[PDB]
């Protein structure tokens with residue numbers, strides 16, 4: 001009902017998944033109507049980039065926010081955690097151009113946010129409510145918003161790989177009955193060994209390891225300790241979608257369905273929705 005921020009400042013450290021750079025992350029409370037703002041504190045002047053669809057850059061690997069010649073790479077997992085915990089306002093300070101990958105999931109971030117504490121603010125919380133279907137497609141990929149009285153995220157993947165043979169590749173999460181933390185937050189990012197070796201040849205995925213990603217070779221999951229969920233891969237796609245959806249700037253009242261979608265198509269959906277003014281409205285929980 002009311003806007004939420006952090007109660008205290010909290011710090012964490014990690015490595016950027018693509019850049020491999022050590023990064024210091026500081027989450028800070030922020031005033032009412034700030035939204036989630038990334039701050040590049042290594043730069044003078046400090047560059048603030050609100051986590052909004054208009055600040056997304058063209059990047060095929062992850063969601064990247066850009067302002068001038070400055071970027072903040074790989075924001076989706078931390079944004080998913082902000083969205084999952086209903087954090088309206090926060091500054092996310094970074095000492096480098098990439099959010100740390102942590103364990104590849106939103107687990108460390110949801111724990112970090114809860115550890116900082118939650119602070120109720122003196123302003124009504126606003127939600128973006130989907131009023132009509134908005135859909136984007138490209139080839140076999142689709143991402144759609146549908147009106148829904150609540151918040152629901154559906155995803156389907158379809159990989160031609162034996163690890164995916166008979167494995168859950170579709171999942172739907174209705175957040176009125178399911179906990180973001182319990183069933184989505186711990187889902188780790190994943191990569192196919194071929195895709196990974198190719199990113200490595202482009203000097204990308206430098207901070208990647210079996211400690212922060214599920215690595216799938218031609219036969220099996222390489223990670224010795226296995227999966228956190230039988231449907232971990234599709235649950236991570238849901239985690240990614242929730243982070244991308246949070247670039248709308250407010251919690252969503254609606255349903256998202258993704259069909260082999262990724263950050264590029266998710267962002268195209270956000271832009272089409274915003275441009276389609278009659279397809280959405282910004283409302284309070286009471287309204």
Ligand SMILES: C[C@@H](O)[C@H](NC(=O)c1ccc(C#Cc2ccc(CN3CCOCC3)cc2)cc1)C(=O)NO
Nearest residue numbers: 062076189190191193196205208209210213215240
């Ligand atoms: C939708 C998601 O697929 C998407 N994830 C990514 O695109 C993504 C994930 C992980 C990585 C990585 C990595 C990495 C892991 C291990 C090794 C070491 N070895 C290399 C050879 O095999 C044995 C191990 C090197 C690098 C790269 C990219 C996402 O979550 N977007 O949000």
Ligand SMILES: [Zn+2]
Nearest residue numbers: 076189236240
């Ligand atoms: Zn991801």
